[PDB]
Amino acid sequence: MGIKNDLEIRLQKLQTDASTAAYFLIEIYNDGNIGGRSVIDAGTGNGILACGSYLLGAESVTAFDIDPDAIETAKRNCGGVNFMVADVSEISGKYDTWIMNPPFGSVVKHSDRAFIDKAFETSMWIYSIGNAKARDFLRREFSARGDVFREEKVYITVPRIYRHHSYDRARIEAVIFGVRNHSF
Amino acid sequence: MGIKNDLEIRLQKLQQQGYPTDASTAAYFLIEIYNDGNIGGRSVIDAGTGNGILACGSYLLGAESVTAFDIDPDAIETAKRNCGGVNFMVADVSEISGKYDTWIMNPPFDRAFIDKAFETSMWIYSIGNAKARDFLRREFSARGDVFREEKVYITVPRIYRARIEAVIFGVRNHSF
């Protein structure tokens, strides 16, 4: 029932939710940036975005996280992916596409800019999905080093257990960025 | 001791299964690329990988990522056993389309592999029979800067002397 649904069910077998992850990845795929491409997934966590890229036919997929426990789980989820434990400062290879899922929001740190800097020194096509609170900062930074062809609003549910009132909004705002590196 | 010697012994233990570049020459070749700074922490692609010796060697030298392809399914199966940390795949060179820091090949001389190398990688290396030296030099010099064209000898059985003249090419892509 569509590539998004077909991918989603494969992601659900693994140990961003599967629907959102599938949506995000299919966009990159339709842009022509997954299939037959070398891809690197930064801050891979359980590896869902890396496994998804592999499932979509990426020529090669590399993924890293600072947490060894996350990598241990990721490797079992999809062995075909080149998973590694590493700090972003350690990344030094070249890849067609860079994917990341930034946790930071309003407050930016040395690390937050570290991922952006590394992305532009590493890949031609850069994608990010995360909190919409970093929207202004990210757009500014991405547009200063590349062409932002995508800045899309996507809604993420906030469990009621994390809400402070019945009249509060049920779904916060996230943002998807797609950028073409000015460098290579 | 010796980085070259250590790698050589490791590569020799690799299963042949499916003139091959001997472990010594392979180690020598890869160490040159490593010292050029194009293996360690880099994304490497080994074209026509065979039993995967050059791909496994690149992995053992700390490549950040290694991809390798061959049109022979049995070679790829043996390669995967030799070093599972490498992204081995069955494929014709025409199907390759990703970008990598470094392209490594061992041509049995085909412009097909050469064209793909220049389309995909910043650094291009080749090792093979010295008789293809003129052909390859012409092909490489047009789309890149040849910084290495070295004569070396590969150890081979006498059944077919025990040495054959080979040539090593190191090229920097004009592109990228």
Question: Could you walk me through the main structural features you see in this protein, from its secondary elements to its overall organization?
Answer:
The structure is a homodimer. Chain A has 184 residues and is α/β, with parallel strands linked by helices. Chain A has one domain (2-184): Rossmann fold. Chain A has 6 helices and 7 strands. Chain A has helices at 3-11, 18-30, 48-55, 68-77, 110-122, 135-145, and strands at 38-42, 60-65, 82-85, 95-100, 123-131, 146-157, 171-181. The first copy, chain A, has a 7-stranded mixed beta sheet with strand order 3-2-1-4-5-7-6. In chain A, α3 (48-55) links the parallel β1 (38-42) and β2. In chain A, α1 packs across α2 and α2 (18-30) packs across α3. Chain A is globular and about 45 Å long. The termini of chain A are far apart. The interface between A and B is medium-sized, with 20 and 21 residues.
